[PDB]
RNA sequence: CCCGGCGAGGGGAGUGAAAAAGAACCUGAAACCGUGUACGUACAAGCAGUGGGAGCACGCUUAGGCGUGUGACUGCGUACC
RNA sequence: GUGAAGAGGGAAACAACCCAGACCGCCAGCUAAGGUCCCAAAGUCAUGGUUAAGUGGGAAACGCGGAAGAU
RNA sequence: GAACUCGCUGUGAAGAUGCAGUGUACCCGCGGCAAGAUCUGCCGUGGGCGCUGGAGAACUGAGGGGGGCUGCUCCUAGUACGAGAGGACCGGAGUGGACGCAUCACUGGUGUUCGGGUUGUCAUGCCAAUGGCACUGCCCGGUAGCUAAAUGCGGAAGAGAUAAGUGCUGAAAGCAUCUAAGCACGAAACUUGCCCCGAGAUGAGUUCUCCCUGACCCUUUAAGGGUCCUGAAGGAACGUUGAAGACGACGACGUUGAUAGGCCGGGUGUGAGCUAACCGGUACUAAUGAACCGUGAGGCUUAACCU
């Protein structure tokens, strides 16, 4: 329905409620302000593009400052698109957190991987290319901790995100 | 590899590179100023700043470690007595590097490394 | 006389018919390497040329559609011994 | 008969198939073989039918089947 | 011999880059893979230009690619069907395996840049105590990162369209029939459903934002040319650099500062000390002032709106 964009704080094996060390990911949940909403008439489709974080004005150039002023929100780390559920429409300016995500236990995660240089053929194929640093589509994950006070989203297993790299979490429909 | 790595490789023998670092640090501290290429200049600064920072604390163990890493009686004798009080207020960044173009013989970039005070 | 390194080389002045005769020294074509001139080419497939060909600059009958330089393109075209 | 030692035109190219022996030039017309829905030039011509299977547009002998073929 | 040196199909003194048909491809480079290494072929990555005023990003997105793997058990169930015996649609749930994607926190390996033990020799006026050489002299552990021997997701479900097959009713031909009339279900086979690239898709796409709002002269008389001034938005080369990197390229900082180095504190390691790469603070140092490219309103034709 609506996704979130954040960063990978860490990935460790935390004790379960029963008291068993289980792999779990540490993902921060930053309040993603709504910047622009698309419509099927003006642009041909309806979807919401949001922003996360807050970057200094030095990096942001004045045309982007005007774009964000149109959006009515401060400039952040960037813009991330999210498909609308084809039903209710949100409003520009508000921000969302994990909130209702604790109702599916099938949320998907997207992100990058380790920074890995162009590797040799022998070590990568056993024909020179790159591995990692690509968008990941691991799916069918289960949420573990949904504590919104800490603004941390925890899911089962590992997360496809490098240290300090951006990532997205969406209410998947696959399994 | 090539990511989150501290210290340029400077392909050489490990013991040889350690000996060269020790000799270069000794020469620079003796002359108070040296001319070295930037790739080696940055490593020189990184490996010499810890010694001057440790020189602030005067103790038998500290003097033994300084002599162990320096192997020069005069250098250890002059240390812990002059550089310490001179940069007592300063905490870090005791040296500065200024580029000086390139060497004509082998197009090797060169840079002067010298103490920030540089005198007095 | 000047630049240049107190060299090499070059540029002014002069001699010299002539220095587009300067000691690498009569005249100085091609193969090979550059600059500028005018034209085309960054969505278009193959012995690369052949007839047609609008345009792009110039001189011409001072237009009257002539040529020089080229060809975006079109039909055809599978080196020599 | 051809090539050897004949160009040119048609068949998708194809030396062996068909028409057809170039003195040269000319921005004319008429024809041979082969074609007239285009690419690519010419009737989407006329008369009565077969073909309804894309056979046409690749396949024998054999009893409509035979028919499987060029990644 | 010269090249403006593509793939497939057909012919071919017989595997055709040069022949006929057909499809694709902006031009020019760097590093690899060697199918036929000068060249063609495939992957990663760049410089010039176009998308028609310039720049900045965000995406619809045609199109291409990754995969439709699999054993067992459970209420169903020794139940319906089946004469007894035999024995389901179930495909809902969990549980292993081969593989890709992802992370070192648990298992550890590596981690010659961290610490400790120690043999021979030399050196510090000499003991203690330290350093070089002997593969890091030889060993014991190990910070950060990378690792499989560690686990996280997985091969969907569903939908469209289906071949064969199965059909509700039913004549021509007082019957039957999947068909002639009305007129359906349906393979694991195709597509979609998840994601990567992707508008160089030259058909060159859509959304928003910021900026350029001077003058003069000439000609062969127009998307004409030239001169002084202007140098906007935006971008890049330098300076600090990175979990991006062979070189390119991308991201962050750049005195309106934690971008890099060092210092303090915390933690780990080693064994009260040293602590490289782990985290918070600190301008103490390096990151400047500047310079360069980039405009002066955007061409023509048709239609609807106020004039």
UniProtKB/Swiss-Prot annotation, chain A:
Keywords carried by this UniProt record: Methylation, Ribonucleoprotein, Ribosomal protein, RNA-binding, rRNA-binding
Subunit structure: Part of the 50S ribosomal subunit. Forms a cluster with proteins L14 and L19. In pull-down experiments interacts with CedA.
Lineage of the species this protein comes from: Bacteria, Pseudomonadati, Pseudomonadota, Gammaproteobacteria, Enterobacterales
Listed GO biological process terms: cytoplasmic translation; ribosomal large subunit assembly
Family matches, as Pfam families: Ribosomal_L3
The protein's name in its UniProt record: Large ribosomal subunit protein uL3
HAMAP family documented for this protein: Ribosomal_uL3_B
Gene Ontology CC entries for this record: cytoplasm; cytosol; cytosolic large ribosomal subunit
Function: One of two assembly initiator proteins, it binds directly near the 3'-end of the 23S rRNA, where it nucleates assembly of the 50S subunit.
Species per Swiss-Prot/TrEMBL record: Escherichia coli (strain K12)
SUPFAM superfamilies the record matches: Translation proteins (SSF50447)
PANTHER family in the cross-refs: 50S RIBOSOMAL PROTEIN L3, LARGE RIBOSOMAL SUBUNIT PROTEIN UL3C
Domain of life: Bacteria
The keyword Nucleotidyltransferase is assigned to this record: no
InterPro entries for the chain: Ribosomal_uL3, Ribosomal_uL3_bac/org-type, Ribosomal_uL3_CS, Transl_B-barrel_sf
PTM-bearing positions, type N6-succinyllysine: 38
Post-translational modification note: Methylated by PrmB.
Annotated family: Belongs to the universal ribosomal protein uL3 family.
One Gene Ontology MF term: rRNA binding
Keyword RNA-binding: yes
UniProtKB/Swiss-Prot annotation, chain B:
Alphabetized UniProt keyword annotations: Ribonucleoprotein, Ribosomal protein
GO molecular function, one term: structural constituent of ribosome
Family: Belongs to the bacterial ribosomal protein bL17 family.
Known function: Requires L15 for assembly into the 50S subunit.
GO biological process, one term: cytoplasmic translation
InterPro entries tied to this protein: Ribosomal_bL17, Ribosomal_bL17_CS, Ribosomal_bL17_sf
Oligomeric form and interacting partners: Part of the 50S ribosomal subunit. Contacts protein L32.
Record's protein name: Large ribosomal subunit protein bL17
Membrane-crossing segments per the record: none
PROSITE patterns the record matches: RIBOSOMAL_L17 (PS01167)
């Amino acid at each position: 329905m609506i996704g979130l964009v954040g960063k990978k704080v860490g990935m460790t094996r935390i004790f379960t409620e029963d008291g068993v060390s289980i792999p779990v990911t540490v993902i921060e949940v930053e309040a993603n302000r709504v910047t622009q909403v698309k419509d099927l008439a003006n642009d041909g489709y309806r979807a919401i593009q949001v922003t996360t974080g807050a970057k200094k004005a030095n990096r942001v150039t004045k045309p982007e400052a005007g774009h964000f002023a149109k959006a009515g929100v401060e400039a952040g780390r960037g813009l991330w698109e999210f498909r609308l559920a084809e039903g209710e429409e949100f409003t520009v300016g508000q921000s969302i957190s994990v909130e209702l995500f604790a109702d599916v236990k099938k949320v998907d995660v997207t992100g990058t991987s380790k920074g890995k240089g162009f590797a040799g053929t022998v070590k990568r194929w056993n024909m020179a290319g790159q591995m990692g640093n690509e968008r990941v589509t691991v799916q069918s994950l289960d949420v573990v901790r949904v504590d919104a006070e800490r603004n941390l989203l925890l899911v089962k297993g590992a997360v496809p995100g490098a240290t300090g790299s951006d990532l997205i979490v969406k209410p998947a429909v696959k399994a | 590899m090539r990511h989150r790595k501290s210290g340029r490789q400077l392909n050489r023998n490990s013991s040889h590179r350690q000996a060269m670092f020790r000799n270069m640090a000794g020469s620079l501290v003796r002359h108070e100023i040296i001319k070295t290429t930037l790739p080696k200049a940055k490593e020189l600064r990184r490996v010499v700043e810890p010694l001057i920072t440790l020189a602030k604390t005067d103790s038998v163990a500290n003097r033994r470690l300084a002599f162990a890493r320096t192997r020069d009686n005069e250098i250890v004798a002059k240390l812990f007595n002059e550089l310490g009080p001179r940069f007592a207020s300063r905490a870090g960044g005791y040296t500065r590097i200024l580029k000086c173009g390139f060497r004509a013989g082998d197009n090797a970039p060169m840079a002067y490394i010298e103490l920030v005070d540089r005198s007095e």
